[model samples]
Target chain A: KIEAVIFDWAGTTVDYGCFAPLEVFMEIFHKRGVAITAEEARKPMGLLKIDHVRALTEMPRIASEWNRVFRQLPTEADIQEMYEEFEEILFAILPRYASPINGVKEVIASLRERGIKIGSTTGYTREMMDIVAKEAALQGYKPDFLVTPDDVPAGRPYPWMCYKNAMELGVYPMNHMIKVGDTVSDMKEGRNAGMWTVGVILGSSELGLTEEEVENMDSVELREKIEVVRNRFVENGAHFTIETMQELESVMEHIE
Target chain B: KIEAVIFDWAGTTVDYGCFAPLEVFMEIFHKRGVAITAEEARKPMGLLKIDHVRALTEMPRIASEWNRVFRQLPTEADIQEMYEEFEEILFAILPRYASPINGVKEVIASLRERGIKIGSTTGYTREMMDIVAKEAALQGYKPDFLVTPDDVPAGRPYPWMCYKNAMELGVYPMNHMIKVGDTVSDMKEGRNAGMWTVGVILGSSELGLTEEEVENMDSVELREKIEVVRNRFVENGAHFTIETMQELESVMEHIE
Candidate 1:
């Protein structure tokens, strides 16, 4: 039986579009005089901020450009500097994105009613999550335990955060847990943790589109887009996909 | 000033030769019909026991040999089975190795007298350490805090256990503490934790020589052997080397 459900923060729970981190990542790099694309910013979205900066710097295109402009390879010091600024911007903006997505509170209530413990994992540092967590709680959605990159040695795709969550939640065997998120890193994190992984499709950052955009699109085109994102999640090893928080109850029932 | 000292259990303080784990590892594998040499078993010493088994199973020669005999890559089930046997043997014989090394009790007393907190890390699980810890405490060498692989997501070569020690002991900045042990993995663990790392020469498992053997060796040969092991510690990034627990006082003074 499923004992725990570990949810991702942005996109999966709050900040329906996962825009807070993405915007701040781009802004921080721009402040550093490096112009990174949306894809570049989102590529490392679920990693710890310092690791995200390191991953960005290690990208061949970014690395070569940085070397040519700065006359040196990016170092740990550079990562620390960027991360400090990233944290500041994220903290300032995090509250604005803290509203639980449509139906999240209801779904959480249902899960809690069934005696399933709720936990959360996030790419945000504890400091950044402090603001988001407080605001989210005010809006009636707080996980029983919230784990951040700061709580683990490594973040998404490494599984340590998920393991920490399970340990704190007193869950075992990993297979008895379900990890729900809206990013490829989330799927990989779940897979690495040996849990059942589910990708949330609607309002997901993976779609890189707004809820309004998705709603206003032609039905045929929306279906095509949905399939594309769904296939990506599956290829990345997601065990299931739900269109939105509303579908989560049915999925839970299926698992039960 | 150093706020705390983190130590390894077997070779560093309690067990003079770190022979308990090595012998059990060799015996466990031999029971499985695999003839692992002492070198192979000792190579991954200081890691969590399960991780040690996984590492051994991943070694090319060992993996091929196991595959030849078992007809498949060693799975988690195999590691778990082997680890259970290892723990059973270790717990049964751990008390025999629980004696504090020469001068260890006095050195610990001196550090405690100086008001420095003492913490310890071990490859042993908490269940295994329950026996060794009680025995050592009875012999007057219990650290203020002890961390095991079971306490953290990863053991040596990862900094979580050391970090956990520092957290529980209320030490910070890593440089404000020292980690002492007698294995290369110990050196790497300390380095990864950003603490000053010290390798003990005479009683180290890395040297693979007993105290009596060292005592009986010719002066020139002893010096040469000491230099060989000391160089290995330096190459592995240890900040200092001490001949025995007796020399640790001078090393602490030098750090101060």
Candidate 2:
């Protein structure tokens, strides 16, 4: 019986209404005489922000070339100035952003009210999360627990946080716990941890795959993906796929 | 008019994916016998993971009370053990769990063909990114330049990394630059740098919502939210929103 749900943040909870990282990045670079666009940003969409930054600033040759081209690399002063600008842009969009997927509040509240525990995992930092949490609270959404990459030596695709969450929620035997996420990483993590894994195609992480991607997904592809995931779970001894978060009610309905 | 792209790694590019720290706390606590879940974790979703650990292990009153309920706080040994488990997870999933998002290869090729420079940024330490970069290369993903938090004293929601990308890419006159990202922090970084800011809704970060919530959203609610974000942008002096990433081609078409 599934007694708990582990949720992923970004696409599953809040919709900042953006695509991947490349587009915004291209825009930022454009202002600096190096132009990019939302389309260009799409390539590297799922990376952590820190990893994104690393991909840009720390290229060994770039650092040296930066000195050759600009006469210097990044300095503390530059970082400070950039942060001030970033905060201003972020706060502005906070209101325009949408909160959570459909029925998120109802589902979470329903779970909480039902004595089923809720937990979440995210890559966002405390400050970034604060903005979302405040927004969620206004809409009456909340979780019983939250976990991030920093929470353990490993983050997603590694089930440490899930394992940790299971341990923390006191959901034993792994079979009693279920994981819900939009990305392949979330699925892998749940599979690794021996918990039920559900993959939803309609969240923030799928790069906004059109209706065709969702509808035209062949059972071959779907089943292949599911099969790989299924084998993963079997290898690790987890549960079957639940398809969508909406299925949770049915799963719970039958669990008892 | 776009020249370059700056990407954040963890939740943006390679998809290590994010795990909430509070979830870890609950996991830690769960092992100790305290049963907490989404409710407790939600209150502190975005905090740094270690800080949460400190809260569980060091808080005089909270620790004592938790110990009374669960027995004891995690010791250094326990943390280390968890780390090893996490490493194994990372080694397994980090390699096979992610692939480049759609349009990524084409975008890079198109941009390079146009003579536009490409760059990246991340939060992963140099040592860690080595693995990700290698795997990404194996998958045929590569960047012209890369940056990390260690390169700059500050990280996301801060503009240093973005600024550094611009500086390194030889991008000048910040307004000519553009930034694309899935999170408010990414948008904020661009705005802070006085570059164009674009938000992507279809990436790794926006999963916290359900479809029903999106369908049932009232214009007033969305407008109010947009207004809030607008005010922050106006306050911060950000550029206009360009809609989704797919719209980039259209916008560029229009710009031309």
Candidate 3:
């Protein structure tokens, strides 16, 4: 009955640490005379870019600081202008983050062989995803269908894009679908869509460590970090968490 | 600096009383052996078709009746099927509803003459709106930009379509924009986007009265009816409610 599996891009499938958007987000805000931490930038990672900017502005500390510096609250014009700059930076760097995460192709191929359609939903706009998608395909990762916020009405925590994916993939009954991602927004997107939600711990943005950093870290520290990320995903209502894509097959098998 | 005015299609600018969608919604449900009332069908009128179907399934009486007949809660597939049928009926009947409401062309012309951009946001999908847009244009009532749920992540009440309209029309500072519509959802869409929101009373879905019905009613009865509709729009946070599109020009001037 598992008709399809929908994956999130960035830390879930590519851009191992979800660094592409995070860097661009911070860079944009910095250029606008406001400095935001990486954690603040990553907080609304899976939202549409405009919504992401709006969300950042709504943060009390950021909002007050912005008002203090600018003599007023951030207007829609400010968000739109900032988002445009973010897009320019994102487009320039997206291809660099497009390499498939370890074991992605193998897992996707396995799902394909089992006749499970592969669909993807992402916070990235169609324009941003176009670059990442082309580069990822060259590295041997291409979903059967990919939906972005541009394709639906709202992004994460809203089920429109997931429903759009189901409609496109000919998948029925959300219960027969699986959504796998690395962010809390992704987990919420899946839960809102009524799908079986799984969060990936290793190589995820939520873990906030580069692949090399993860690989070189002490085992005890890595375990603790993994536990923290896993709990965050679970608290956000993810049904399951896997350490890596290599473990996905067993989870899918267990579900079946 | 009032740069643009965004209008809703059905009821506010065309399809007097927004009968096209209301009739189609009721017909679709009736075919499925569930008899939904006109009020129930019209309740979520300005939402995307899929969302509208989902909303209907969420209604208490309708949900219980659907479960009683189908032996379970409505599934995504069920909503999809109903939405597909709804689209078919809507497309077939849409052109008949594309006539511009009284005074719309004159008001749009007046705004355009004053160098204000005209934009539109609608609950209709691009496919559904295409027919209506083309027909409306032939009737000489085209806007500079028309955004539908298909153009953004989410539809009315979420503000994405309105934002898309603003972006496309090059209208900044949402405070300088006006959203004129005929439904609570449209008012919410405008308010959520931080724009001035106006509700049209006569010929609006919220009024639920046809031109002939309003014209033929006794003065006392009509006044009471108008009061009820005006209060509904005001309570829903509409900044103003005009008796008809004919009165919209004065309100715009007053805002200026």
Candidate 4:
């Protein structure tokens, strides 16, 4: 039986398409005179915020752009400068994305009714999560346990937050827990924590679409696009993929 | 390649037979009139120290004894009180046990020559490890990275510290790392972190013998006793077992 379901913050529970970090990364990089594409901004989503900045600054295209613009590759000093700005911009914009994703509350209610504990792990630091979580709770979405990267040594792909959630939630033996999230780092985190991993696609960073865009797309086109996302999650180690949180109930039943 | 070897402190690297915590636990418990046996104190040897006290307090016999003496089962209040005392008792005496165990420096040098990074995790809190590490370093033992239960959400068997080591050391995919320790909790932590696990028997908590006792024992009897400890490590989750720290080089070579 699944004893707990640990969700990721952004694309899995709120911030459709994980646009919060992408906008901030793109905004800060553009202001810094090295314009980055949305794909570039999203390439390393779900990492510690500063690590994400470092990853962006180190990418082949971005690094080349930085050299052309600043006459040197961005150094640790440059990353520190960018990251500080990134957090400030993120703090201002993140509150706008704090509303819970559609189907999140219902799925959580469903999980609650079944006696499964609800937990969440995120790449957001406590300072940023303070705003996000407060806004989220006011919007009627609060997980039983919320863990941020700052609460542990590292975030997302490192598995520290996931284990922290497990520790806080008191779930054991690992396999009895399910990590439900929307990014490859989430799957990796869950896999590292020795728990079953599930990827949710529709409102996900992997899917990279707004709800209107998703609903307006033709069935054939959307299904094909979702399959591409599904394959990526599977290849990255998610045990299952669902189009939305609503499908999680069936997934849990199948696992049970 | 085996990129890193994360070792446990006490038994595996410093204090022989993990006696530092054992003697402290016995002392404090005896002072409190509980008089826990060595086996009782060692049963939950690799947990966070406060959690260790709670585990000991919850053991059927110990609980019964506490009830007999104190007129009640120990509560969270009592555990905290005991743990604070345990830390004070441990701090003063831990320096005496901080010298590196036999063969540890040689094994570490061999691993360094092979370019395997040395990392360590322990049940000790950072406050406690400050003393252990400072004293150990004075005697020529210092890991490249040292993490404790206080460094993470929880201690061994949770894997946060293991993942922290990976993050700080920048090792990847988990399997390239090996956790070398002398306790079952270490094996469990490594397994949960998706890394290879190894156990060392001689001078280990499982062997539960002083260095002199080990040398003075009959050969057949000592080997037979070591097998019992070896089997426990295997049954718990270790992928490999070595009799001494000197044998880790062979184990690493075999792993490579």
Candidate 5:
């Protein structure tokens, strides 16, 4: 029996379009003289955000040039400004640019009324979380229990936050707990916690497959692409895969 | 010969103790009535700050109450206010709480004077980067190049930014590069880029590990930990490891 359902916030529960992170990232990089597309920006969506940044700047040549411009080491103020700009774009600008993906709120309330607890995980800090929380609420998608990386001793693949959710919610026999996310890191967290892990295509793809790209895909292509995406999680020990949340309902119904 | 060295800014290259993330998280959680500790708050230190907040609120119990307290969600003004408060605490307040790790500036400058290029990365946004940049300048740890998550198309483990750096700077074969950081994800990025990776026990390991913890850790124990960490890079296809920056000088000698 599924006692609790833990959902990833951005792509899975709320669909703010893939542009939320991409726009934030692109704007920040643009200031640094590196340009990127929404497509390129979305490639590493599922990992922890800081990890994402480290991946970008920890290069020999880029770091050299960046130092020349800034003339000193990077400061927290620079990161904060980038975040504020991203928040402005995501909340104030993107509401008109993107619509919530279908069934985000419906799924949450449906799960809630069914007595199955709901939890959400995100990489957004309180500053950005405030904007996202408002946006999600405006879109009618509110979580029952929310955990950010800031709330736990560890985030994502470490399983500390997930395990904390399970223990606090009194969910027993961890396998009955399910962790749903769009990234491979999310799947890793679920698997590490000994819970059922489900990866969705509607969100960030491990292989960088877009939802439209995935939709145009035939079963063979879907399976092939998904398998390619699945390999990332498989190496980290993920359990199951679904193309969309619609697939989740069927999986739950079958088990029930 | 080491052609380039990538450094993590907050702890390793500068004096910031990572208290900004901890302080912001603590204040947010405290506002929500969940009072956490600095010890607990540092769990997601290396993650993207916004995503860090997401991880905390994702828990089921907290999400429910968060929804109630934040009824109708947070506005852009609200987010800014929260960040402003946290920023004041971090930049204006927390620096008084700690100083930079030992030998950070000397190492960066020493590397530079020796004709070795220097690059730096941090999780701080542009705003936070401002404060950090000011402090780093004061400390004499200027980098030849600096980057944040904002500066890349895709953050860590994707290798796009690193590859971009290699192309722009003409660093060949990826073997002459090294990314040094205190987190596991940093190592993953280096491995992903096929660059040499080093993990430092200075600010990173010391952030949480007690004196007792360090005392019980012998070179054998330390080697085991290093091996466990090395396995991640190895699994991702990387080279060897060293325990500290001091080791890097010797490793460079050996390679030369």
Candidate 6:
């Protein structure tokens, strides 16, 4: 029923809970002595990093905080500088976060066994994805096609990446494909691409919990938080929401 | 309000009746004594020229005739050779056919007056469109953004060209945009791109009638022929149909 599944990196399949960008995003704002929370940092999680920085600065609290600190709003110049810092730090730490999340490789391999193609799109720039992809390949998680924010016109909610994945995977008519990610922007991207979308939660940036944090948390409390993110994904037009990558198999069954 | 309109070349806005490639396709086959009809030549009118040539060669009648002639079906080598001949002949003659169909420039100017961006996608490759576009521009027709098969992964019915135009034109939420063309393929391309589609008849390849033919044909006869093509567009999923490009303004008005 489905020809291809385009996955998002970080929260969906790697970095456990998408902590890679969190550190750099918060660190960039920290140097200015304007403390922003993880929620604020992850709010714009799936945009190009430069656009991500600008999105943060546009936040009501972050904007006021920045104004208080520097008597001005974030400018493109400031965003570019922060993005350069982001690239340098993120590239250096990417390899460490490239390990496939639990069950991710098995889920992907199982999909391949069904003759479904695996494609990917990410907010990570091509240079940044180069490191993560190579590391992930060594760790047994590799997609047939990979595209980044730099690859086409714009990222997330714009549908260019998903279209690129479609072109590379040679899938067409869009409805025969699915987009899986862990961000609301990812949901929008899939919706805009006119494909089915599945949002995964436990391993998502929306939850923003590390592997250790999730493992130690009480089950009841985790379920409540997962529901919160699940509702957000649905609100953002996800066709289905899952707790982990492995659950996507059933969703595809349901899609048909 | 519409953000932009993506128009197809030949039949949609220039080369009334899309006669530009008919001669080449029929001429190429006439050399082989294939005696293919104009309907056969225009059957796949909006595909890339090479794909167009290949499509002709794939027709059951054309295929059997070629088999009878060469003792085998059309080979990739044969198609490539035919395509090379096509490109050369079409390029030299493109300028002569670059004139915008009646009311195209005026309708476009009105669209721009309404602040709508004008974009174009064509089966013409970049080199082929270069001559046509320069001639059209000199005659007061220039799309704000022009994309050819060479500009994207693939052409009509693939959605890549539309996406590239969206990226270049900075239009989004494709429902707010429109695609106008004269071929059934254009309708499919628009449907695939998630945009509203308008099919034009009088100057379209689908009708296979020159402006001169239409001028001399009886009104009832022309309407009967047009309805035949119009139903084909509707079956192929065009949201609207126009007798001519000038009628697109009213279609846009109704679309809103």
Candidate of highest lDDT: 6
Best by DockQ: 6
- On the 0 to 100 scale, the lDDT of residue A116 in model 6 is 92
Error of 6 at B153 (Å): 3.0
Per-residue lDDT of model 5, residues B101-161, tens digit only: 6666566666778888776666666667766666656655566666666765546655544
- Provide the lDDT at A37 for model 4: 86
- Per-residue CA lDDT of model 4 for A103-123, tens digit only, reads 678768877887989888877
List the candidates ranked by lDDT, beginning with the highest.
6, 4, 3, 1, 5, 2
Please, what are the lDDT tens digits per residue for candidate 2 over residues A1-256?
A: 7788888776666552234233445444445544343433442333345444434445554356445546668566434544455455565665434466656676676677778898987655556667777777676666788777666654555555665565467654455777776555556677655567665544445434433555688777655654544443334333444444566777655555
- Looking at model 1, residue A100 earns an lDDT score of 87
**Cα lDDT for residue B215, candidate 1:** 79
Task: Give me the iRMSD of candidate 3, please.
Answer: 12.3
Q: lDDT scores for all predictions?
A: 0.81, 0.55, 0.81, 0.82, 0.62, 0.83
**A1-256 in candidate 5: lDDT tens per residue?**
8888888876666553345666568777787775655555665566566656554555455456568777765556555666566656655654432335676555666667779888767666655566667766766766777777776554666665665565456555556778888776777778766677887764544545455765687787666766676666666666676766767766666556
- Flag the better candidate by DockQ, 1 or 6: 6
DockQ, all candidates in order: 0.02, 0.01, 0.02, 0.12, 0.01, 0.32
Candidate 3: which stretches are off by over 4 Å? Answer: A1-256
* All candidates in order of TM-score, best leading: 6, 4, 1, 3, 5, 2
- Compared with the true structure, what per-residue lDDT tens digits does model 1 show for residues A1-256? 8888889988888887778878888888777668888888878765656788888988887877778788898888888888778656776777799888888888788888889999888877788777888998898887898778786565666766766675567665567788898988888888865688899888898877777988899999889988988998999989999888778667666888
Task: Report backbone clashes per prediction.
Answer: 0, 150, 5, 0, 70, 0
Better of 1 and 6 by lDDT: 6
Candidate 5: segments with Cα more than 4 A from true spot: A36-40, A47-51, A59-99, A106-113, A203-227, A253-256, B1-256
Candidate 1: misplaced stretches above 4 Å?
A: A1-256
